[PDB]
Every structure is written in structure tokens, then in C-alpha cells.
Amino acid sequence: ETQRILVTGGAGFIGTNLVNELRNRGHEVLAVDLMHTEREDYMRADVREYRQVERIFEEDKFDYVYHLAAEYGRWNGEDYYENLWKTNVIGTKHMLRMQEKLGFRMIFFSSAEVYGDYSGLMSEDVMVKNPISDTYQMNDYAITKWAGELMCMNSAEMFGTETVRVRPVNCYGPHEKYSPYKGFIPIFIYHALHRKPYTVYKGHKRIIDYVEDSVRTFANIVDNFIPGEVYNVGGRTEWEHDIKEYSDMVLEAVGIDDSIVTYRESEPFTTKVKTMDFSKAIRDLKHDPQVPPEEGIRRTVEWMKWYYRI
Amino acid sequence: METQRILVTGGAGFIGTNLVNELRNRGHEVLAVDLMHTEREDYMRADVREYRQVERIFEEDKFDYVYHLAAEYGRWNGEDYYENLWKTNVIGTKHMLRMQEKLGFRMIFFSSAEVYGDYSGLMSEDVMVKNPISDTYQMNDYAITKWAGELMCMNSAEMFGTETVRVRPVNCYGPHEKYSPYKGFIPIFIYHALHRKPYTVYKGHKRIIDYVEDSVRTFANIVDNFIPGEVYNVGGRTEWEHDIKEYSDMVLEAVGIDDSIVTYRESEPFTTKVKTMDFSKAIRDLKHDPQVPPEEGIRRTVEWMKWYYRI
Ligand SMILES: NC(=O)c1ccc[n+]([C@@H]2O[C@H](COP(=O)([O-])OP(=O)(O)OC[C@H]3O[C@@H](n4cnc5c(N)ncnc54)[C@H](O)[C@@H]3O)[C@@H](O)[C@H]2O)c1
Ligand SMILES: NC(=O)c1ccc[n+]([C@@H]2O[C@H](COP(=O)([O-])OP(=O)(O)OC[C@H]3O[C@@H](n4cnc5c(N)ncnc54)[C@H](O)[C@@H]3O)[C@@H](O)[C@H]2O)c1
Ligand SMILES: O=c1ccn([C@@H]2O[C@H](COP(=O)(O)OP(=O)(O)O)[C@@H](O)[C@H]2O)c(=O)[nH]1
Ligand SMILES: O=c1ccn([C@@H]2O[C@H](COP(=O)(O)OP(=O)(O)O)[C@@H](O)[C@H]2O)c(=O)[nH]1
Ligand SMILES: [Cl-]
Ligand SMILES: [Cl-]
Ligand SMILES: [Mg+2]
Ligand SMILES: [Mg+2]
Numbered sequence A: 001e002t003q004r005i006l007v008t009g010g011a012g013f014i015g016t017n018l019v020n021e022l023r024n025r026g027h028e029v030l031a032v033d034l035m036h037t038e039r040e041d042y043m044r045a046d047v048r049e050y051r052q053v054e055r056i057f058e059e060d061k062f063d064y065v066y067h068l069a070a071e072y073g074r075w076n077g078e079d080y081y082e083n084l085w086k087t088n089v090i091g092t093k094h095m096l097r098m099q100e101k102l103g104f105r106m107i108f109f110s111s112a113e114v115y116g117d118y119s120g121l122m123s124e125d126v127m128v129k130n131p132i133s134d135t136y137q138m139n140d141y142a143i144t145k146w147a148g149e150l151m152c153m154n155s156a157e158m159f160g161t162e163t164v165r166v167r168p169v170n171c172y173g174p175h176e177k178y179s180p181y182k183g184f185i186p187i188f189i190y191h192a193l194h195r196k197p198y199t200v201y202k203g204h205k206r207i208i209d210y211v212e213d214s215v216r217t218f219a220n221i222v223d224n225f226i227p228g229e230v231y232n233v234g235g236r237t238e239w240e241h242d243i244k245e246y247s248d249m250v251l252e253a254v255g256i257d258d259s260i261v262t263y264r265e266s267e268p269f270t271t272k273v274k275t276m277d278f279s280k281a282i283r284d285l286k287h288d289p290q291v292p293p294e295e296g297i298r299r300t301v302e303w304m305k306w307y308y309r310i
Numbered sequence B: 001m002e003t004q005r006i007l008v009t010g011g012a013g014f015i016g017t018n019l020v021n022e023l024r025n026r027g028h029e030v031l032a033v034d035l036m037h038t039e040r041e042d043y044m045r046a047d048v049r050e051y052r053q054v055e056r057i058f059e060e061d062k063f064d065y066v067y068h069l070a071a072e073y074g075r076w077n078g079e080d081y082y083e084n085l086w087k088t089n090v091i092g093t094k095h096m097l098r099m100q101e102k103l104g105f106r107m108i109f110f111s112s113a114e115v116y117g118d119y120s121g122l123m124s125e126d127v128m129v130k131n132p133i134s135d136t137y138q139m140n141d142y143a144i145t146k147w148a149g150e151l152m153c154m155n156s157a158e159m160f161g162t163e164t165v166r167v168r169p170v171n172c173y174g175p176h177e178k179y180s181p182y183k184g185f186i187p188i189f190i191y192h193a194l195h196r197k198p199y200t201v202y203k204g205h206k207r208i209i210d211y212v213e214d215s216v217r218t219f220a221n222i223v224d225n226f227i228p229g230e231v232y233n234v235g236g237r238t239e240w241e242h243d244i245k246e247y248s249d250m251v252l253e254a255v256g257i258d259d260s261i262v263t264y265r266e267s268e269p270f271t272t273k274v275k276t277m278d279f280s281k282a283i284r285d286l287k288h289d290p291q292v293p294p295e296e297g298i299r300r301t302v303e304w305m306k307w308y309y310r311i
């Protein structure tokens, strides 16, 4: 059965892909984001502004709301913290107030940054059973996402609202624009393509997830929505690589050596190891990513080369 | 006996007014900062949400110590006024952290014992370190703002070497706390009892209440033994724990009426059941030695409210 779905942050990277995927499945989808655009089934709403949020829900009825509207990224959160807190937290509270009033089901976008610098396997239950000091969030961005999770749980507890939280991991792929405030993959690709120098912080491990894969699993939440649940959504546990390995994949795909690269040991204040357990998404959400990092990076290099015309 | 130059944000508030007065009485030079204009000397209006206004405070004076109390106080207040809550408690605190990172004053950050959530065991400070995270999930936005603030203080300390002591005040009450329906239980009980107006007692809860003059003495002692990176519960004594009816009965006894005006309920939903505080750390570092137990403190507060509202 097809649903009426709101996607806030629907003009962003995951949001755009998710909107298209949901529409591809036959759902009716309103995309909402912070700017005006040309596109149909689109509405500008600053989620910081209660009146604008209420306006969304006055115009349309929704079965499901994917809430992605956010100031994304740890460095962004430090440099633009006012926008960060107002959007990520007050916006989420406005959305929860709407949810309490209207009873839609919500998919809340948190972040695997909620796990802080935890160096064990990032299973969802780390944010339940582990000593609280394991996951002290390392930047404001990460704290907003954890605050959002707490607010979702308090709302469910107080009003019986129905919410699934997701913790996206290190999503990358075609249609993600470059900026210096994006994740490492688009930074590496854009710099490599332009033969421009960039830094690799060696002492870190990540699992990158291809947008098409992650979006398929996000879209699957509608088909198996379990109120109160939380899911890591990302690649595969065994797709862990260190940062040099990812850089080398980018350089290989561009076809250049690492002469443009400055290597540093570690990025301060940055999660060392971010190795995720996806068994829960595998169980409930038919999580089955098809695009491993080598292949994904190639596709992303190809998209960036074409899109920025290198 | 060393004079400090001290800023107190939230300095026209309940704890803030008492703290400013106590610090001044000790010989410190204290600027009070708050959200409204007042008649007071050594006072400046600054909305801590507004970076420019925060920056103005630090253009005017250099401070050795900053007590950061400016906040939207209270769990119900946080739910009904959440925009102000998040902007002030969190963005305001981040502006203060940015100033601290630039200027290097020492800060006392005011958190809340609500950060312990509904934990049923002894609320030692390290419950926020060693206990499973689910033991202390914060139960309302206000509690989340305080926990977010503590995390931000720790991150600033890690990243910039800023020097901050966090305090978790508990259930502070006393003279100079005005009534509103958004205050804690003690001034609600007192004001309603004084007016012979009905009020509700949620029975299935225990609290340790702390008399403002005692708590401010300990908060003031921090500038005398400031250990960067520390966190302290500051409240009464573990032995002064009572259930809510017991506190209600103290209020009624002090007003001189019976409990005919009281509506009893078994428990308040989404409210911490038991808040058994461990004050060993404050006793150890801060000469914490509260002198006013609840019975006496309630009497003093009843008397103060009686005169101030001319009942
Ligand atoms: N990309 C990842 O790897 C990753 C990792 C962890 C968490 N997340 C979270 O997933 C979501 C999507 O990530 P993304 O990579 O697509 O980020 P993105 O920045 O591309 O998407 C976020 C969108 O939200 C919009 N937005 C910001 N403030 C808004 C406001 N006040 N009102 C309305 N819209 C507003 C932005 O304009 C943007 O289009 C975000 O919530 C992000 O924090 C992503
Ligand atoms: N039992 C307690 O009283 C208790 C318990 C736990 C935590 N706390 C915390 O201790 C502090 C003092 O509590 P209180 O009982 O005196 O509360 P209060 O409300 O009397 O004091 C807070 C003060 O902050 C001011 N303020 C609010 N927003 C501001 C802004 N944007 N800019 C500047 N000033 C602003 C208010 O005007 C007020 O005077 C608060 O941070 C509170 O959250 C108190
Ligand atoms: O220019 C850059 C940006 C990031 N990184 C590293 O890439 C990893 C992922 O960083 P990002 O901010 O993309 O994601 P997160 O840290 O949230 O997983 C971290 O180890 C960073 O140190 C890097 O080496 N160079
Ligand atoms: O009108 C009221 C307000 C509060 N309380 C109780 O008093 C205690 C203290 O609540 P408050 O909000 O003052 O503080 P906190 O919950 O943060 O300790 C709780 O058990 C409440 O249920 C009560 O019985 N009646
Ligand atoms: Cl993230
Ligand atoms: Cl409090
Ligand atoms: Mg438009
Ligand atoms: Mg003035």
C-alpha cells in the first residue's frame, strides 16, 4: 500500500535520493527544505519556524514523515552552531509537537556520531546498555542528534507517538555536491579531480555506504515500521577501511598518484573507529547493500567528473 | 581572602541573586547579568542567546570567574517554552564557551540533578560516567539542555583546555524565590498554602531539598578550590530525604493549617521517583556543610513569602 509521505530536508543529498526512491515505489511524497526550488511536490519550510512547520501539516495529510531537515556535519556544527541548534533541536521539537497532535509515524534521522569515540562495535544497544561515558558526543552536531533521539523517546513515552530512529553512518554517492563542510569522500573526490591537495588523517577507520543502498533501506522502513525502534543504516561490517585506503581508492578511480596528499597521524576530536553492527537493519529492513566502497567511489568519481565537467 | 572579578549570568534570578549577594559579601567584585533591565548597580542586561550582547559583557570587564546560571529553569517551563529553552540554555551556553575559549576565564556551569533522569540508586556524580546510559536518559527538554551543556563544557575543555567546574543543583528553595506555577514544588506548596488555595501532592516521590543560603555558600566556595574538569552535586544532606507528603506537611505546619486543601495523587508521570543524592564530592572539595534542614528551611521560606506577598 502506497503512503503519503513528507520528507523534510528533501532537497538535500539523502533527502533528494529518498524522495525519488519513495516516488519510484508509488508513494505520494512532499519534499520540504529551506530554499525555494523549481520542483513539483515541493514546499519551502524552515523547520525552525513553528508557523511554517504547522503550514506543512495544514496543507497536507501524511502517513509517514522522514525528518532529515538538519544542519549536517561536525565542522559545520562548530562553525554554524546557532543554525545547528535551532534547526536540529527546535525544528525536531516542532515536528514532535506536530506528531503529538496528528499521530503520523516518523522516521527520525540521527547520526552514528551519537556513539562518540566508542571503540567497540557500534551496535544500536551501545546507546542503551553501555556506560554513558562510552559515547559522550564529541561535537555539538553529535549532541543535537542524541538530544533528538531522547526527545523522540520522551515523546513516545508521554504521548504514544510512533517513531523509528535511524543512525546513518558515512553516506556518499552521485548527487552529493562538494563543499569543504561535506564528508571525507566528496572532499577527496573533488580535490583529486581538480588535482588539488588534500589531507588524509591516517589513524581512523570507517565504513562508507553508497546512497542508493542506504536509501533503499530507509525506504524499506515504511514497509516494516516498528514504533520505538532504532537502526544503524550503512554498508557492511566487513567493508571497514582506513582513511588512506579510501583516499587510494579515490586516486585510483581518478587515475593519479598520491603526490597531492598530505598525511597526518590522526584528526583530533574525531572518532577513531566507526565499525557498525547492521544486524538489526538486516533483520527488519531487508538491509542488503550491493555497492562496496571501491565500486561506489568509482561511480561517485564518475558522477563528479561529469557534473562539475573535469 | 582573595578578591575575584566574577560574572554571574542569570544574576537577577533566584540562586543568582543570592549568589551575587554572597560573593559580594565575601569581597568579590561581581557583575550581575540577566535578561531584563533593573535599577541595580553592577548589573548589565544581556540576552545570552545574542552573541553580540554576550560579547559586550566581556568588552566591558575582565573576569577571573564566570558563574553561568542564565537559563530557562524548570521541566514544565521547558515543555511550554521550549524555543526559549533551547536558545538560552544551549546556544547561550555555547556563546559563553566561545568567550571562554577566547578569554580563558574559569567557569562554573549550572547543570541540574535532572540529568540523572529516573535513576533509582545513589546519584553520585559518576553515575553520569560509569552507569549504563539508559539509567539516566533525561526525561524532558530542560534536563536534556543541562546534559547537553555538560557535554559542551567537556568538549571545550578537551579541545581548547578551557577550565570549568560543573554543578548539579538539586531542589533549592528559600527566601527571594518568587512564586509562579512554573517554580518547583516548595514555593508552589508555600504560596498555595499561604493563600489557603488547593494544590496537588504527588505521593510516590522522594526529594532532598536544599536551602538557598546553604547551597550558595557551597557555590561561592568553588572560587576558593576550583578544580578544572570537576562536577559536583550541590544540595542538602543525604539524610534529609523525605517523601512529598512530608514536605507538604512541613509547609502546612509552618503556615498553621491542616491538609484539607491538598489533593493527593499516587505519583506524577514522567517525574523522577527518587533523587537520592551523594554529596561526598562537595563535602570533600567545597567544604560543603549545609546548616538548614528542610523543617527549619521551610519555616524561613513560609515567613519570607508571608511578608513579601503581604499575606
Ligand atoms: N550523510 C551522512 O553520511 C549522514 C550521517 C549521519 C547523519 N546524517 C543525517 O542525515 C540527514 C541527511 O543528511 P544529508 O547528507 O542528506 O545532509 P544534507 O545537508 O544534504 O541534507 C539536509 C537538508 O536539510 C536542509 N535543512 C537545513 N536546515 C533546514 C531547516 N531549518 N528547514 C528545512 N530544511 C533545512 C538542508 O538545506 C539540506 O537540504 C541529516 O539529518 C544528517 O544530519 C547524514
Ligand atoms: N533547584 C533549583 O533552583 C535548580 C535545580 C537545578 C538546576 N538549576 C539551575 O540553576 C540556575 C539557577 O536557577 P534558579 O532557580 O535561580 O532559576 P531562575 O529562573 O530564578 O534563574 C535563571 C535566570 O536566568 C535568566 N535568564 C533566562 N534566559 C536568559 C537569557 N537569555 N539571557 C540572560 N539571562 C537569562 C532569568 O531571567 C533568570 O533570572 C539555572 O541555570 C537553573 O536551570 C536550579
Ligand atoms: O579532509 C579530510 C576530512 C576527513 N578526513 C577523515 O575522514 C574520516 C571521516 O570524517 P567525516 O567528517 O567525513 O566523518 P565522521 O568523522 O563523522 O565519520 C575521519 O577520520 C577524518 O579524519 C580526512 O582524512 N580528511
Ligand atoms: O505541585 C506540585 C509540583 C511538584 N510536586 C512533586 O514535587 C517533586 C519535585 O518536583 P519539582 O518539579 O519541584 O522538581 P524535580 O522533579 O526536578 O526534583 C516531584 O516529585 C513532583 O511530583 C508535587 O507534588 N506537586
Ligand atoms: Cl553524521
Ligand atoms: Cl533542576
Ligand atoms: Mg518553493
Ligand atoms: Mg539595565
Ligand SMILES: [Mg+2]
Residues within 6 Å of the ligand: B087
Ligand atoms: Mg531568536
